[model samples]
Target chain A: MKILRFNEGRWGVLEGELVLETDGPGGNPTGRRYDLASVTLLPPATPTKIVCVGRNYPKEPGLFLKGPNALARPGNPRDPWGTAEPVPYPFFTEELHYEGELAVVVGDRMRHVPPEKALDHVLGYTVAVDITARDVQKKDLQWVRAKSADKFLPLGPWLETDLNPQDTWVRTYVNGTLRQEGHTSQMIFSVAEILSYISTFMTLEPLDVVLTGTPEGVGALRPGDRLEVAVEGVGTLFTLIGPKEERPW
Target chain B: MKILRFNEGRWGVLEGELVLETDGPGGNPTGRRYDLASVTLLPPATPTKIVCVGRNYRLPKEPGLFLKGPNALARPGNPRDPWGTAEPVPYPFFTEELHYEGELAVVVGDRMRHVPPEKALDHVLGYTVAVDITARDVQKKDLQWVRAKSADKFLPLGPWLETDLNPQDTWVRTYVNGTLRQEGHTSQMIFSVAEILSYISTFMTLEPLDVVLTGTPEGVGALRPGDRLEVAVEGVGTLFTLIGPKEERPW
Candidate 1:
């Protein structure tokens, strides 16, 4: 089943062309069906902290964190949705790369959980674009701004609860041109292992997310260009490239 | 007047020996004073994101940002407490040097950006103590300080937030096992609280109760087993920290 959040706080289950609006804030389906075109869709899950794993070696993976401010929703109007959000070009980064990742939503409070028992806590699966400011990432020790600028992670479309994470593959396209592609089969650390590894030092509360290690083949962004990232079992996410933003804020 | 949040989500004011439970939420006191001994004190502020600035070179220039994730927040049960929550020391054998940084925390009051220094203080809610506990072994070894700096209970933010203080002339000191190992005066700080707020807002959007950890004054040191550390800012308040195999008061 597919879960989708809309209009900032409403949640609904997507069934073909119609969405069954839920009751009492979230998750309680009231059977109130509405056409998908009648609402502004939000990212399927709102994560407290978006944790990511870095492939340090071919076999070992490192853990990194991004604040909640980086969470971005899918962009475009109803009936003709195409992009996730306008790619925000920051002045600090001359080179920006799009790393398509499969994000897992934590369904329970996880702490010191063994990798073998990790899957029992997964709420669902969704796709995300870890837009990175490679320049700032190298210059600064912390990836706060490099990984977490406003609208940096354009996440949604919907969340798929049922899928074999083992069969997932991530693919990225830029302006109708396929720029990057890789199979999750190649990831050094599996999703379960990464989650368990992260729980050793940090407590992942419910609604917290973990982005499995991104595969190889990351490409830079260009203004007015189109970028779409798709996961094998999960759906695709779209985003448009915008101009470099000045530090006027 | 100083404000405080304690007893699992209630707000009060700490005035010497008495805690005046505030009316409504915060700021407006209810005049219902209770002895400080009877109240369970939480962290001064429950900041969503605790942002800290690193001052290694100490050139007296702009400050950068670091995160101490929400897992860092620990509360003081009462004034006569040790480490407040008795936070466990994650295998001290592996910890070569578990250091403590006595810092003055700037509790944010407004949601703002591009705020000028003149208006920065106006945007502040108050001040508190942020004990930036670090695992030195992992700090220099990793590119990201998430593990080195952000372990559970790594930040002891308490016992309350004090307003109406002269920020330019405050003293932050640390006592490990009853020995004064660190002390730094506010005048020697590279970036003032206002400038630190403005600089942090450039990258992060400031929110109410969002803490901005001003750079440490000087004289940083290490934490060992059975070390009962108490971090105090002249006017802000005092925070009790314990380091050992016990993640609690080593009673």
Candidate 2:
């Protein structure tokens, strides 16, 4: 089952080539369907927190709480980019890079869950490019600035309710050429272990997201560049790179 | 005026020992009041985020962020402590040093940036107590304290948000009930609330309901079970809590 959230809070399921509309709460299809091209798309889930592993790794102080605003959906037909979102450049940072990651969308509230039961809490799998301002990372230490900025976190296309992440591959690209390509099999911590590790101390509410660490071959970002990530079976995430606007204030 | 959220989705204003009912979203008092003890209390604001500065000890190159997602908040009458609200350390599975840093919390009311120190107060909604619960042992193990710092009940705030108070000149003291263990004057803050708030604004937008905890005063010690905390901020209410032992504490 592939579930999608669009038009603020509306829910839908992408079946074959049609989107069957569903109720807001249970996500049960209303038996009303529409062509996928006619609708806008929101992030597949409304996550309360964006949790991740490594660096601000789950083994320590936390899933370094990335600013919640850093969460945004894969762009719809709304902007010029069909499925990609804009990547922001914080004034304080110099180098920026894309770390392709396969992200987990939590389906149930989980706390102190054993690794074996961790997958049960996941709603499905989705793809996202963890945008990082590489220079801010080394300077800030906490990686909050380097790791989180508006629109820097791009998620979605939709949520794939079926798939074994361990059996998948994560391939990232710049423009038309492939860059980082590694299998989920290479992850330092499997999806189940990462979920169990995070739930040990922090409770992941339903819809909250967990970005499993990036695989090898991470690369830098440049203006006039388009970055795309494809996670086998899950889907793809795309983003456009450009100069960030000056500070609003 | 003190604003409060209680009993699931109810909104009330704490007035002269009574809570005057108010509109949930608009916050306009309904002129209906109830004995304070008769109502269950939730955190003052449903904070979209909990942002904080550092603890009382050794300074850092910059302020680190210790956030308590919405799920970590403790409610009055919660299971852990039936008497009322109690802050809990939850004994992080990875550390032995559970310490409490008492500090003032700023409740931001405006989405602002580069706010001048003089105009900073205008964007604030109120004041409340903030306890920055940390596991110092693991904090030393890594610069990203997310896991070491975030635990359920690690941040216990409320009774209500006091909307009127001069934040610069206030006292923040912590005690194991009656014994004063640590204290810090707001005047000693390395970066005043204005500087801190403005600095944060430079990066992210501060939601009206977002919280910003200030730097700590200089008192620190280890936590043991049955220890109750009284983190008091001048002009704001005090919050209490009891520590406990770790469970499987499996890593």
Candidate 3:
């Protein structure tokens, strides 16, 4: 089953091109159905904080965080289904980049949870693109602007409730050209380990997101570029690159 | 005027020795009143993110900025509530040197962008006190400060928000067990509150209820379990946090 959120923040389950509006993820049906094309889709989950790994696939993965402001819907709000939103290129740097990864949505409050018990707390998995400002990332004291500028995380299409996390592939494309590919089986730290490690120090509330680290092949992006990040068994997250954005607000 | 959140997260106006329930800061009264001592207090503002300025005082160069997420927020422990007092500051077992940095925290009132220092104060809601808890050992060991500074319960903020304080002239002090360890006036800061807010707005949008913690002054020191630490911002009320035992690893 696939779960999504759409117009006016109503949760829905997608079934064969039709959307059944519901109370929440796996929630009771609200007795309404609409063509998926009629509603503006939102990020599948509302995360309090988007926790990410700096380099997990490649020991204790280095972690970073992004606030809610960084979360942008997969596509442009004004458009129809399958059309992605353009990620605004920040005016601060010369090099912009994209990292394709899988994002796990936590279903329950988690703290001091063991790696073996981590998967039991996850609601599902979704696709995510960790947009970054490569230049600023290297120069800053922290990755605040580099990794968490507004609309930095283009997440969703929707959440896929069933998949073997370790036996999946993450692939990225630029302008329809495949640029990156890797199997989750190669990750240095598994999904459960990452979640368990973070839970030891921080409390992850329901709907919180944990972005498994991106696979190799991350590179620069320029204005007007179309990016596609596909995770097999999950879904693909589409996004675009527009002109430089100067205003922070 | 002082504004606060108390007893089940309800907003109220703090009258002398009493709390008059209301809609929000400067909001109409709900006609509900209780003695201040009987109600538990929560952090005055609910910030989506807590932005902080590093080395704002006696800066040798530009001030560095960092972030603390929502999980870092801890209410100023009110003695009246057992839950509030039980774990005001949970010591993380990963590090040995726990430290404290007391700062003057600015709460944003309006959404601000490209704002200038001269007009930044106009966008502020009020001021409060914040204690930036750090695991000094982990900070130096980790690649980033995520474990050291952004850990849960790392930021203890607010007794309430005070609307009529002078940001530039107010003094920020820290005391442990009744002994003063940190003392500096905001006037000594390299980046004034207005300048800090203005700089942050230039890079990221500042939303209403978001908090900006101005840099701590010199004289920051260690904290141990059972120590009662107080972060006082002259006009704003003092925030109290008690250091609890280190969490035992379940692994």
TM-score of chain B of each: 0.88, 0.87, 0.94
**The candidate that achieves the highest DockQ relative to the unseen native structure:** 3
lDDT of 1 by residue, A123-231 (tens): 7888888888898787674777788776677777777888877677788887778877887777678888888876776778787778886777787876676777888
Candidate 2's displacement at residue A97, Å, is 1.4
Pick by lDDT: which candidate is best? Answer: 3
Scored against the true structure, residue A163 in model 3 reaches a CA lDDT of 84
Which residue ranges in model 1 land beyond 4 Å of their true spot? A23-26, A30-33, A56-60, A76-84, B23-35, B56-61, B80-94, B246-251
Sort by TM-score, best first: what order? Answer: 3, 2, 1
In order of listing, the candidates' clash counts read 11, 8, 2
lDDT of each: 0.74, 0.73, 0.84
> What is the DockQ for all candidates, taken in turn?
0.40, 0.46, 0.55
Model 2: which residue pairs collide? A54-A57, A60-B147, A61-B145, A61-B146, A61-B147, A61-B148, A62-B146, A62-B147
Model 3 chain B worst lDDT run, 10 consecutive residues? B78-87
Q: Write down the DockQ of candidate 2.
A: 0.46
lDDT of 3 at A2: 86
- What is model 1's DockQ versus the real complex? 0.40
The docking category that best describes candidate 2 is acceptable
- CA displacement after TM-score superposition, residue B104 of candidate 3 (Å): 0.7
